[PDB]
A paper describes a structure:
Voltage-gated potassium channels (Kvs) conduct potassium ions in response to changes in membrane voltage. Kvs 10–12 have three intracellular domains: an N-terminal Per-ARNT-Sim domain (PAS), a C-terminal C-linker domain, and a C-terminal cyclic nucleotide binding homology domain (CNBHD). In addition to voltage-dependent gating, Eag1 is also gated by the calcium sensor calmodulin (CaM). CaM binds to Eag1 only in the presence of calcium and holds the pore closed even during membrane depolarization.
In the presence of Ca2+/CaM, Eag1 Δ3–13 remains open at hyperpolarized voltages. Therefore, we determined the Cryo-EM structure of Eag1 Δ3–13 in the presence of calcium and bound to CaM (Eag1 Δ3–13/CaM) (c and Figure 6—figure supplements 1, 2, 3 and 4). Two different conformations were identified for Eag1 Δ3–13/CaM: conformation 1 at 3.7 Å and conformation 2 at 4.0 Å resolution. In both conformations, the S4 helices adopt a depolarized conformation and intracellular domains are rotated in a counterclockwise direction when viewed from the extracellular side of the membrane, but in conformation two the extent of the rotation is larger (2.4° degrees for conformation 1 and 8.6° degrees for conformation 2). The rotation observed in these conformations is in a similar direction as the intracellular domains in the open conformation structure of hErg. However, the extent of the rotation of the Eag1 intracellular domains is not as large as the 20° rotation observed in hErg and the S6 helices remain closed. As a result, we believe that conformation 1 and conformation 2 represent pre-open conformations of Eag1 on the pathway from closed to fully open. Rotation of the intracellular domains observed in the different conformations of Eag1 Δ3–13/CaM occurs with CaM bound to the channel in the same orientation as observed in the WT structure. This finding suggests that binding of CaM does not clamp the PAS and CNBHD domains together to prevent rotation of the intracellular domains and channel opening as we previously proposed. Instead, we think that more likely CaM binding to the channel helps to stabilize the hydrophobic interaction between the PAS loop C-terminus, Tyr 213, and Tyr 639.
Author numbering:
A (entry chain C), B (entry chain A): 13 to 243, 247 to 304, 323 to 406, 412 to 696, 704 to 720
Write the structure that this text describes.
């Protein structure tokens, strides 16, 4: 989803110059000029912009003012038109421009821009000079001006005569077909392929690829079973059905889109055809095709290579893939095993059984042995396939019972083959199970490693039982709350815009509730929220000590706090209360008067003095509003004088009961008088 | 454990306004006012706080002073009362407040706060104005004041008449029931559920979940054994016993607490019932329930899913879980194997044995074959279960001996099934063993990797044998001491309060023993200990070179040091000796006069000059005490002049033995005279 506005214009353009103006701003200021307009006008892009889209700076005394009034009327009524006006350049040469002005709509169908396309009718109108070396020189300057039409586009004209109307019609007809083609509408819309070209990540294409994965699995089950065991007519019916489906997939893989390394999407049918024909098309056509060649239908699962990169990333998905590959290879080498047994049981022209094959031993094991009439069969075909899959499963699972077990020469060659293949299939199943378990236990074991390091540290340094239980409680609580998420790292992945917007959403509990912040600009809100820090505190986990530096005013967005000065609660802070020190007015660091113990699990939103002062020095219009609207709930700097009632009572009891010292004492008293 | 003091008040309150005062501070200063009191009083929270809890700022000339004296008596005797007083607002409107004053106890049952709850009796007393637009306007202002009672709570009153006493009784009876309900006592107590609701992490509930895990294991062993092998009356007795226990678990899972993603605990019985009925209750009731349905008692181990998240994290615990799951699945598919053999041995109505099944081959193997009378049995039922568990264990362990080995059609279908299941069970056992070994060898192999990098570095850069052995000795010694604990990282996990308190405990060996630090404030102690660095040194591993910058005064908290100036020991530093340079008085960096070699394994506690100067500039009252009480044991800055006895002896021997040079020499001499 993008707004590919300019790219459409320069794609359809073929070297035509244009500028864009506003359709809602008075005098219609130029917002964009392409480089060809900078070459044609003789100006920079900086001096062209914020001039009028009617090119008022190119007007002159030779310009007809009624054409100017028609152009301004065209801008006033928002209609497509075209005009031919003598306008000036930066070197003031009279140039007969062909303008083609067109409004540009919105997604909401409101006109928002004026696209005006430019060309030159200098050679086709007349030469006029205020002063020149020659009439020939004025003609030469006119031919050097009118270049993009005559020298490039209208090249079949100047051999022929009477070409003025024809060249004007060609140059205007390019823009006239563009008047329906380039209506680019200035919308951030989704990029589209031409129709009859289906998308790669489409829902229909995804379920189509899933049902063709199911059908490749179907054919890989059934085709070796058919060619090995030599079996109705509904099976040929569904064979024709799945062949039709695979040829429909041939057509769909011809018509689909594609992802390359540089091109994230592919839109062109010749591009997808050239990408198709090298790799995929020849093996898929070799699959989609006398009976002995039917094994090449096993190349159908070559297109499961396309699902390869869909599900090669996920560990459980590649485990499910390898379990299916294990069972499929079991069926394949079961069919190979039956083919070997059926070869070996009647490899002799003398019709001898040789008394030794897995087929004959399976028959003699289960009953119904072989006998001749002819040569009457022994075991059932379904029982033979069941036992053959059983044998191949015993050899692939490395179980190896040995009921069905190889006993002749090519049987043991195949046994060596299946065991060396099944070793590696069993190993790769074990490897993906181990990889699944390590990638599913890594985030647990790193947490347990951090926790064991902390427990060993607090055991080693003889930290007391209360403080160590406190630290361990904090660590398990913040892990259970945060789910092991480094919030700084998750912010660092994002760019600066998303980082600021995420931080504004995190500190919305301050910025929507405080009257100091209800006047904040959007940029000031970003610049504040990038320096805010949300701080969670446990009950009894105090924030400021007595005498600690108060460098951070905190907004209690959740929970409750108490302010203990001299063992006495002085202020309870609730939801949406601001404490700390008034930094912008104090301009000095002070020690905290009082402890700030936390009553409940509380969420504060602190902000350091240096960061807040940076933001308030940069947003000078906001800083006065902050100073006028942020009343601190509790100044931690100011000392609150009081008396305890118990001490006042005891002093009243003592007042009811009741110069050599004064000379080293009144001195100090006078010092306090000077204080 | 928290002190949910305000939340209880605003939960029971239903929009009643209140302030809190101190019960031990004279004049009873307001420590908290809710937002409704800010709306009612017409003030901010900042101007209300530190005023008296009797609302002295709202007194006026129309206020009766004897009601004031009764209120101050109520504050003096610490008793619950209620009063109706005309008090002023910020816009000085006379308001008939209903106060309800109540003391608030402690966990130690001492009164510590005054909660006074507020309401309006403005409409119910009288209109009185100093000046007004109208008596009707004064009535309108009174109706706008008395809002929270009449417009909201007392809404059944104003249709009826004679409602004054009734509305006053209702508004005071809310607070009168609250006078027993909200006695919130201001204690950091544990949060409690209502009784007959049992805790999640409780010790009784944990051992209950463990015995029900044991019983689910019991039923998963016995129920397939029963339904497969078709077995007294004490077994039905213990069946009824365990069914009673499972229904007791139904009741307990109805009445327990619960943990959600947002809610860490759940206290409500309707909440736990609604959480129960979707997922757990329907499958547990399907479990806790003609004989052919007994297999659904295997759904009892669905509640072992609840222990899932108790022990899915620990690697050895999930290995023990998977070993038990392996053995349990062995027993299950052993029962399935016996059921298949018992089906296949008499699948014929002709009572033929077919000469081929694992049961018949096991009978013919071990003796006592099958014979008919009727059809007399072969092997013992216990021997059949033993051999069936043996077969299923051979197929799950991928051993596959082949005594007992499948030979018929559905037997080999089951064999393929058990081998494909046992492959993945064997793989996941192998994966958890590999994960256990990697997470138990990671902290060893990262240490060996660091040590190998160091040995390769000291081999590569041709560092000499003595220095390389020294570095390697340091590295293995600090690993054996620290157990591989990044002390900076373990501090960084903690918040600022716990970080400071841990650092104060780490530097307690300085802060309890030094007379310079016995005057330190608590905040100054935190601000010092966050910048202290404990430094361990090896014997012969010197700290300061000759001429090195002395930017850190060190406290030798353990071990002994020697100070070598010019190959001569000048001072031995023992436990609790401070050396370095007197930074606050010097205010310049100097070179060290002498080497400071370490005698034993010593622990110093250094602190850099810049950090110490920051702390002493911020704690100006502490800095003078530090300067007066910290005598440096050895000034490393000052040069100590002396003479060696051997050189004095040799010079005495030479003194007993004994202008063209002076002109380039006496000049220098005079320079030294100007020095």
């Amino acid at each position: 989803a993008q707004n590919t506005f300019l790219e459409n214009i320069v794609r359809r353009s073929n070297d035509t110059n244009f500028v864009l103006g506003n359709a809602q701003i008075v005098d219609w200021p130029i917002v964009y000029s392409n480089d060809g307009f900078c070459k044609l006008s003789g100006y920079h892009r900086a001096e062209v912009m914020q001039k009028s889209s009617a090119c008022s700076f190119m007007y002159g005394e030779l310009t007809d003012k009624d054409t100017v009034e028609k152009v301004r009327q065209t801008f006033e009524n928002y209609e497509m038109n075209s005009f031919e006006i003598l306008m000036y350049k930066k070197n003031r040469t009279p140039v007969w421009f062909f303008v083609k002005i067109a409004p540009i709509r919105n997604e909401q169908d409101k006109v928002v821009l004026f696209l005006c396309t430019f060309s030159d009718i200098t050679a086709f109108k007349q030469p006029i000079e205020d002063d020149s070396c020659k009439g020939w020189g004025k003609f030469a300057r006119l031919t050097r001006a009118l270049t993009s039409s005559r020298g490039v586009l209208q090249q079949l004209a100047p051999s022929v005569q009477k070409g003025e109307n024809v060249h004007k019609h060609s140059r205007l007809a390019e823009v006239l077909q563009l008047g329906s083609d380039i209506l680019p509408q200035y919308k951030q819309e989704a990029p589209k392929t031409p129709p009859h070209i289906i998308l790669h990540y489409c829902v229909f294409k995804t379920t189509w690829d899933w049902i063709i994965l199911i059908l490749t699995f179907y054919t890989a089950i059934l085709v070796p079973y058919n060619v090995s065991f030599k079996t109705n007519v509904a099976w040929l019916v569904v064979d024709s059905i799945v062949d039709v489906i695979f040829l429909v997939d041939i057509v769909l893989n011809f018509h689909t889109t594609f992802v390359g390394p540089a091109g994230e999407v592919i839109s062109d049918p010749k591009l997808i055809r050239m990408n198709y024909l090298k790799t995929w098309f020849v093996i898929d056509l070799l699959s989609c095709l006398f009976s002995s060649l039917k094994v090449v239908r096993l190349l159908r699962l070559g297109r499961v290579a396309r699902k390869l990169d869909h599900y090669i990333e996920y560990g459980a998905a590649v485990l499910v893939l390898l379990v299916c590959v294990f069972g499929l290879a079991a069926h394949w080498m079961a069919c190979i095993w039956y083919s070997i047994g059926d070869y070996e049981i009647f490899d002799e022209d003398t019709k001898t059984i040789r008394n030794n094959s897995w087929l004959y031993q399976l028959a003699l094991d289960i009953g119904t042995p072989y006998q001749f009439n002819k040569w009457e069969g022994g075991p059932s075909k379904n029982s033979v396939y069941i036992s053959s899959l059983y044998f191949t499963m015993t050899s692939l699972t490395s179980v190896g019972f040995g009921n069905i077990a190889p006993s002749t020469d090519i049987e043991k060659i195949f046994a060596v083959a299946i065991m060396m293949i099944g070793s590696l299939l069993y190993a790769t199943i074990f490897g993906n199970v181990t990889t699944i378990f390590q990638q599913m236990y890594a985030n647990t074991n790193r947490y347990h490693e951090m926790l064991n390091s902390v427990r060993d540290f607090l055991k080693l340094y003889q930290v007391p039982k209360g403080l160590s239980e406190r630290v361990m409680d904090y660590i398990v609580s913040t892990w259970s709350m945060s789910r092991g998420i480094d919030t700084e790292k998750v912010l660092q992945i994002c760019p600066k815009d998303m980082r600021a917007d995420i931080c504004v959403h995190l500190n919305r509990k301050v910025f929507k509730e405080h009257p100091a912040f209800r006047l904040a600009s959007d940029g000031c809100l970003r610049a504040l929220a990038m320096e805010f820090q949300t701080v969670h505190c446990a009950p009894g986990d105090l924030i400021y000590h007595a005498g600690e530096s108060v460098d951070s005013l905190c907004f209690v967005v959740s929970g409750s706090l108490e302010v203990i000065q001299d063992d006495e609660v002085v202020a309870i802070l609730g939801k949406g209360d601001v404490f700390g020190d008034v930094f912008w007015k104090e301009a000095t660091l002070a020690q905290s008067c009082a402890n700030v113990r936390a009553l409940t699990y509380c969420d504060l939103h602190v902000i350091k003095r240096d960061a807040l002062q940076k933001v308030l020095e940069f947003y000078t219009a906001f800083s006065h509003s902050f100073s006028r609207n942020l009343i601190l709930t509790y100044n931690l700097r100011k000392r609150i004088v009081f008396r305890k009632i118990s001490d006042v009572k005891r002093e009243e009891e003592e007042r009811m009961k009741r110069l050599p010292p004064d000379h080293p004492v009144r001195r100090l008293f006078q010092r306090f008088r000077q204080q």
